[PDB]
Amino acid sequence: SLNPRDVVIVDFGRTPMGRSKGGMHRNTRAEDMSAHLISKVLERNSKVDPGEVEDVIWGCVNQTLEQGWNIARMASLMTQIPHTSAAQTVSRLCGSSMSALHTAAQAIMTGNGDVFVVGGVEHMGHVSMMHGVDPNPHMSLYAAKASGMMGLTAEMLGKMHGISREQQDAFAVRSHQLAHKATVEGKFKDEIIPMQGYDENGFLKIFDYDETIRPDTTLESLAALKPAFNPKGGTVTAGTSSQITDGASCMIVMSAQRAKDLGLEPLAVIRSMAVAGVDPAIMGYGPVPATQKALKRAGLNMADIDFIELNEAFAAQALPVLKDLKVLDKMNEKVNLHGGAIALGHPFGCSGARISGTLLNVMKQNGGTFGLSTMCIGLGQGIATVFERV
Amino acid sequence: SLNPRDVVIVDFGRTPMGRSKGGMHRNTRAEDMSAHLISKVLERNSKVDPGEVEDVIWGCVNQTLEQGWNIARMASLMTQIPHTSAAQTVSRLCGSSMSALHTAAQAIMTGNGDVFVVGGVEHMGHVSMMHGVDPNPHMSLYAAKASGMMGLTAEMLGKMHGISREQQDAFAVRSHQLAHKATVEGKFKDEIIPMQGYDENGFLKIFDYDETIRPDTTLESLAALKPAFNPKGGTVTAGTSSQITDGASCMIVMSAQRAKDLGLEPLAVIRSMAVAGVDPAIMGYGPVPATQKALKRAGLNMADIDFIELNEAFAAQALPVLKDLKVLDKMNEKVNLHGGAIALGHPFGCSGARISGTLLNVMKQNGGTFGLSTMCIGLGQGIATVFERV
Amino acid sequence: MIYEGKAITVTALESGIVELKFDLKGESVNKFNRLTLNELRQAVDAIKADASVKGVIVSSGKDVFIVGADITEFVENFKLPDAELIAGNLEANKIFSDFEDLNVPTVAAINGIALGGGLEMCLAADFRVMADSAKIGLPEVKLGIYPGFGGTVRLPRLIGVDNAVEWIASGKENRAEDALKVSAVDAVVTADKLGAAALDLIKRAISGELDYKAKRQPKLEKLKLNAIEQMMAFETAKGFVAGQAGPNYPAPVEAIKTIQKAANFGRDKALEVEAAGFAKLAKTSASNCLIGLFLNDQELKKKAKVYDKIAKDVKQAAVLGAGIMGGGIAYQSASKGTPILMKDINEHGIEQGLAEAAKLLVGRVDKGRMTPAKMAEVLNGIRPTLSYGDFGNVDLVVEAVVENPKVKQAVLAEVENHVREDAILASNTSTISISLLAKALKRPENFVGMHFFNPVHMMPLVEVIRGEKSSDLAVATTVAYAKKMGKNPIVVNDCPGFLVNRVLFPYFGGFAKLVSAGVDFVRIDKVMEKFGWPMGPAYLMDVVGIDTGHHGRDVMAEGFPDRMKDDRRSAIDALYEAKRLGQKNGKGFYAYKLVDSSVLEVLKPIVYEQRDVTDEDIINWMMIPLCLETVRCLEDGIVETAAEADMGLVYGIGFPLFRGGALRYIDSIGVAEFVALADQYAELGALYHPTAKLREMAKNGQSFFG
Amino acid sequence: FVAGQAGPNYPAPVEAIKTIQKAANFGRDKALEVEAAGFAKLAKTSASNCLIGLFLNDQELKKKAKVYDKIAKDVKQAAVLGAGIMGGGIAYQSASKGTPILMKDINEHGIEQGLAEAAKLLVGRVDKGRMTPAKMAEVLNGIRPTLSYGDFGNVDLVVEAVVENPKVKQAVLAEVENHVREDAILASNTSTISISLLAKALKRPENFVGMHFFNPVHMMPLVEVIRGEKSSDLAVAT
C-alpha cells in the first residue's frame, strides 16, 4: 500500500564520468553539465511537468568560480524548469548530493512541495580541490590539522583495522574489473545519459562510458605504485584512491501520491535517512555509524539489505567499514557490483546521488528489495540511505 | 497543546554587525566567528546537551578560502559540540540562513533528529562577493546577464512600481533611526552576543553594538549620494542599499516534545515555510510569491500577521514588496521595527536567520502572536517563514 | 561535378556527403560580391535539387575563409526605396535561409578569416569547426551598418543576446579560444586536422549521434529570454552604448533596437526587422549620405595601403615626455606591438607616465576585457629612460614637450644627434608650425608632424602635418605607424591650426554668436545632438576646457585675422574671466553633467540681443561656418582631395557619419542652393561669406564630388 | 614526519613532540615536570656533545649579520647584466621586493625572454589569486629594460649574469665599471669561475664580490656571497 507523503525516486540519470586531467569534460562548465543533465532527464519523463518542481536541490563543494553563487539555480535557469521554481546548493563535502536527496525527501514528507529535482555536480578539473584553500590555524586547537588530509586518515583507519597493501590493491582491481563488466554488459545504459565532449584531439563527439575505468588494472600494475600519502611505510596509493572526476548526477523525486496520479511506476522508495559523525582523524569510518542509525530508523537489520553501495574513497577505508558492518564475506555477492569511486571517479558534490542511483539500478536488475547507499565524509562525517523496491 | 514533532525555536543569538571596510571583524575568520557564536549561545542554554545536536545546518554563500569546505563542520568542530554530530552548509545566496532553519525544521518533523543548531555566516571582508566570479556566457542564452547585478534589478523593479528617490532615501532614514533606537533602548541586548574585535586603532576590545548603524543619516545627507548602479537616471544609491557586513547568526532548534521534556519555554514555533521563484531581472519581487505560499500553508491571511521582517536589500525593492503585500500603510506599525539591512548590514549567508531571529524579539517584546520573516534572493528567488508565539 | 562555378565548386564526396567550396578563381580572397552571392544561389539550388546528397561541408581554398563583402557593388542597390531595398536584402537572405533549411546536416570548416558576411555564411550552417589559428567577427559597425545577411538574427540566438550585442556593437575579431567559449564555434582543432574534423563531425550528424536538427532550431524560433529578462538585457545594452556612441549612432545603438524588436520573432520575421533597420542606416536623401562614407572610405583604405607598403618598419619607437600625452603615445604604441621608450628629464615625469599607462591597463583587467598576461606584455613594451643611450635602434621618434617653439626645437635637434640618420622625427605640437620646428634640425626631410588628440587612447584621428621640407618616406612611415596603432591617419599640409582644429573653431564661432544672441546653449547642443554630433557645442567646450579654447582662439585669430579675429566679449571670455574653466575646473557652461542658473549671471554681459531663432537656423549658424572653412582648407591646399577633407572631420571633430562630411553635406543641399543659403546669413561676418571659387562653381552647377 | 627527516640523532624536534604528547592531558604544573624531564635527557645525551658550540656559533652570526647590516650601503637602484633565464629571475626578485632594477643586454631578443619570464611568474600568482593586479603593475614598472649603460648613473649595485666564460665576464664587468659611480658595488653570478680571477679585469676590485643565486632564482633561498681576495667588507656587507 501507499502512504500519500511517501518519498519516491522516479528516475535517475548521470553523466559519463570523465577524467579531470584533460578528460572529456575539460571544455564543459559544471553549470552547463548540470543544466543539460537535468534537462535531458526531464525529457525521458514527459509526464512530470517541470513547472511543478517546487525546488531543485543540487550538491556542490568547491562553490567558487563556475560552481559559485548557488549553482543549483544557475543550472536550473538554463533548463526547461520555469523561473517560478526555486533552487539551493547543499554542501556536506562528499555526501553533498545525498543530503540533497534527504532535504527534498523531508520536504515532500512534510507537505512543502510535490515534485523535486535533486542531484549534484563537481568539476574538479575547472575547480580543483586544493584551489582556494585557507587552513585556519585555530583548528589545530581543537583537532589535528592532519585530519584535513583525507589520505592520512585513510592510512590511520587502515592501520587500526589492519589492511595490507595487497588487500587494498586487490579491492581496486575488483572495482575496475566490475566497473568494466557492468559497462560492457550494458548495465549502465539506462543511468548514463549520453553527453557531448572532446577527445584527446579536440574533436567533438558524444561519450556514453566512463573514461576513469582502467580494465588493465592488475595486482601487478598496482603493486608498482608508490605510497601517495606516506612514502616511508604507506599502503594508500593513487590506485586504491578514488579518481579526480568531473561529473554530474540527477534524480527526480516526488511524493507517492502525486506519483500514483501520474501513473508512473516508481524506481525506488526512501524508507530511512541518517547522518552521523566521527572523529576527523578517521573520517573514513563515517559509514558504520550513519548506517546503524538508518537501519534502526528503517526497522531493519543489516542482513535484510539485499544490495549495498559504499562510496570507495579509499580501499583502506571501504574494507574496514564493510568488516564492521559484518558483510565483508558477502562482498562479491552484494557490495558495489558495478565498481566504485576508484574506477568510476569521485566527484565530491556528485557522488552522493550517483552511488544511490547506481544502487537502485543494481536492485532493479537483480530483483532486490532493500538497498543501502552510504559514504564517508571529510572532517569526520557519515551518511546513509535505505531504499526499497516495490 | 502542541504536537510532538512541532518545530520550536529555543533561542537566538547574533554577532555585532560590523563594517567590512576595516570594521571590527577585519581580523576574525568567518569560521571562528561562527564557532564562537554557536559556543556562546549553547552556554546560555545549559539544559540542551550539545551531544544531542543531530546536525548543524549553517548558511554561507561564497564558500571558498575561509568559508570553503563545509564551514558548518569546520566551525562545529571548534565548538563544545561532539565529533559525533554532523554539519552541512546550505547555500541559497541571500536566503541561505533561512533555508537552514527550514531544513532542520523538516528534519525534526520527520523524526530525523531532535536537537539542531541552525544559522549562517558571511565574512564579506575576507571573502568579498566579486571575489572568484566566472560569468558563464551561456547564461545569456536563457536570461539577461544584467539580472546578475542585484543593483540593476532593484532599478528595474523600482521603475515598475514607481518609487521616487525621496521615497527610497526616506526608507533608509527610517531604517537607521529605528536601528539606533532599538540599540540605545536595549532592544538588542538579548540577541546580540558580545564579541571580541579590534577598533580603528588595532586595539583589542569587545563590541556589543552594530558599527553599520549611522544615526546621522538624514534625507539631506542621503540626497547627496549619486546613483550607484545607473549614473544617468538612477535612484538606488549606496545609502538605500544594504551594507557589506561581516557577521554570523545562530539559532538552537528542536521538537516541542524534546523541548517540553527539558521544561524550557519556547521563543517561537514554526507554522509554515515557503520558497518561490521569480524572474532574475526583478528578483527583488521574490518575497510576495514566497509569502503568499507561506500564508496559504499556514492557513492565515496577511492581516493575521502582527509583525513583519522584510530584509532590506534596497529601498527600491522593499517598498514594492510591502505595497503588493498590502501593508505599506502599516509600515511604522509592524514592519522592521528595529531597522533593516540598510543600517544593520546584510551578510549574505547570515541575514536569513538574523532577520527571523530579530523578528521573534520584536514579537516577544510587543506581545505579538503571528510573525513573518521573508527576503528576496539573487537570480530570482524568494523565501518566507511564519512563526508563532505561544 | 554537381556544380562548377567561378567562385563556388560544389564537389561530391563519400557517403553522399557533398563539399561546397569557396574559391574565387582569379582573386586572392573570397568575398560576397554580386557574382559570389549569385553562384551561392545556384549552388544551394543544385544541392537542394539533388536528392542523393546526405550532408554538406563548407570550406575554402584560400588562406582565409570568407572576408567581408566588397560593398562597392552593393552601393547602387541601397539608393532605391526602403521597399525595393528591404525586399532586396530579403532576397539575398533567401539564399542563406535556404541553405539553413537544407534537409541534411551542414558544417562550416573555418580555416581562416571569416569576417562580416563570411561569418554570416557560417552561422547559417548547423555545425562549425574552426582552426585554432583563425579569427571571426562582424566589424560592420566600422562602416556605419550592422550585419545584413542574418547576422543580427542568428548570432543572438546562437551565442546569446549579451554576447551577440558585444560581438556586433564592437565589431571586434575573435580568436578560436573565445569563439569556442561563447559557443559561436562548436569545435576548435589544429589547421592540419580541420578537414578531418568537419568530415568526422558530419558523419556523426548523419548517423544520428548528433541531433543536427535540434541544434538548428534555436535560430529559427524566438529568443529564450523572458519578457522581463529582455527589458533588462536590452535597456542596459542600449543605455551603455547610448552614452558611448552619442547622437550619431551607426550600427551600435540600432543593432540592439533590431534585436529587441525581433526578439519574440522567428527567423523569417526577424530577418524583416534586420532588413528594415539596415535600410534606415543605408538609405538616401533626407540627409543620410552614409554613401559618402564608403566613397571616402574606399579611397582612404586604398590610398593608405599604398603608403603602407612603402613605409619603413617601426619596430622601435620612442616618445619625448611622459605624463599626459606621453603616457598615451606610449600606451597606444605598447598595446599594438611596438616597443616604445618614455624619455623625460626628471624621475617625477616617468612616474606620471607609467602610472597613467598602468591605470588604463588595470582598467580593462579589473572588468574582464584584458588578460593579466597581456597587461604584462604591454608594460614590458614601455621602457622608461632619462637619457638617449638606447635610442640607437629607434626608427621613429615622437615629441611631446611643452608647447614652446624654442624648447621643442632644442629637444628635437637634441634627439637628432642620438638616433640613426635615416630615423624619422615627429612632433605632437598643435599650435606651432612644423615647418618652423624643422629649421632647428639638420635633417628636415625626416621631420614631419604627428598630431594626436587628448585622450590619445580615445580619439581615432591622427593628423600627419607634412612640413615644406618633409620627404614622402617620412610621411609614409608616420601614416603607417598611426594605422598600426589602431588609428586613422590623414595627411595635412602645415598651416596655423592644421585641418581639424582650423575647422573646429569657426564652428564654435557660430556658437559664440548664438549665446551672444540670447540663445540658450542648452537648446543649442540638444539641437546639434539631434543633428548627429557626438557632443554638443557647449558641452564639448567644457570637455576641451574654457582655458584651452580661449588660448586656441588667439592662435586662430592671429592666423587668419581677416575673418577669425572677432572681439566683443563672448561666452568664452565670460567663463574664462569668471573662473569657470570648464570640466577640469568643475564649472563651465555646466557643472560637474548638471545645470545651474548661476551661469546665466556670467553670460548676461555677452547678450547683445534677444534675437529669436528656430532650431533649423541654429544648425546653419554652426554648419555654414564649418563647411566654408573646409572649402577654404581645400582651396588653400591644406588637404589634397575632398575625400580627405571630410574624413578628417569624421574622425577628429566627430562629424556625423551618416551625413558624410562637411563637403558632402554641402552637396546634400546643392552647391548652388548652398551659396544662396549662406548669403542670408552674410550679415554675421566673413565666416558666412562663400569663397570666390565656390561662387564660381555655384553658377556652373558644379559640386565638390560629381 | 619529523622522525624521517631528523633521523637517528633527534635533538629538539622528535623529543619536543614526545614531551607534548605526554603532558597533553596535564595542566601547567604537571606539564612543566614533563618539559623539564625531557630537557635533561637532551642536554645529557644528544646535546652533551656541545650545546655551547651551536649557541655561541649563532651568537657570532647574529652579531656578524648585524655588523654587516649597518655599515652596508643602501641599494636603492640595481641592475643585472643579461636577461633570459638567470637575468629574468634576478630582475623579478629585485622587483618583487621594492628594488628598481635594470635588465641590460646586447640584443632585443634577450630583453624579450627576460620580460616574458618575469611576466609569466607575476601572472602565475594573479591567475590563481595570490597577487594583486595593481601589484603586478608596480613590479613590472620596477623592471626597466635597456641595451646600453646610459641609465646606470645612479645604480648602487650591479649583478652580472653573462654566459659562463672567464674572458667574456671580465670584459663585461670591466665595461660596466666605466658607466657607474666609483663607489658602486659589482657582483658576478658565476658558478664555476674564480671571483679573484674576474676581479683582476676591473680597476676597482674592492667593490667586486660574488653573488651566487641558484636556479630558479625565485625558488631557491640560498645566495652565496663569494668574497674575493681583494673584496672590501663594505662590498660584502652591501
Ligand SMILES: CC(=O)SCCNC(=O)CCNC(=O)[C@H](O)C(C)(C)COP(=O)(O)OP(=O)(O)OC[C@H]1O[C@@H](n2cnc3c(N)ncnc32)[C@H](O)[C@@H]1OP(=O)(O)O
Ligand atoms: C537580495 C538581497 O538580499 S541583498 C542584494 C545585494 N546587495 C549588496 O550586496 C549591496 C550592494 N552594495 C554595494 O555593492 C556597494 O555598497 C555600492 C556599490 C552600492 C557602493 O560602493 P562604492 O561604489 O565603493 O561607494 P562607497 O561605498 O565607497 O561610498 C561610501 C560613501 O557613502 C557615504 N554614505 C554611505 N551610507 C551613508 C549614509 N547612510 N548616510 C550618509 N552617508 C553615507 C559614506 O560616508 C561615503 O562617503 P565618503 O567616501 O565621502 O566618506
Ligand SMILES: NC(=O)c1ccc[n+]([C@@H]2O[C@H](COP(=O)([O-])OP(=O)(O)OC[C@H]3O[C@@H](n4cnc5c(N)ncnc54)[C@H](O)[C@@H]3O)[C@@H](O)[C@H]2O)c1
Ligand atoms: N590639452 C591637451 O590635452 C592636448 C591636446 C592636444 C595636443 N596636446 C599636445 O601635447 C603636448 C603637451 O604635452 P603635455 O600635455 O603632457 O604637457 P604636460 O605639462 O602635461 O607635461 C610635460 C611633460 O614633458 C616633459 N618635458 C618637458 N621638457 C622636456 C624636455 N626638454 N625633455 C624631455 N621631457 C620634457 C615633462 O617632464 C613632463 O613630463 C603639446 O605638444 C600639445 O600641443 C595637448
Ligand SMILES: CCCCCCCCOCCOCCOCCOCCOCCO
Ligand atoms: C673558453 C673561452 C672561450 C673564449 C671566447 C671568446 C669570446 C670573446 O668575445 C668577445 C665579446 O664580444 C662582445 C660582443 O659585442 C656585443 C656588442 O653589443 C652591442 C649592443 O649595442 C646595443 C645598442 O643599443
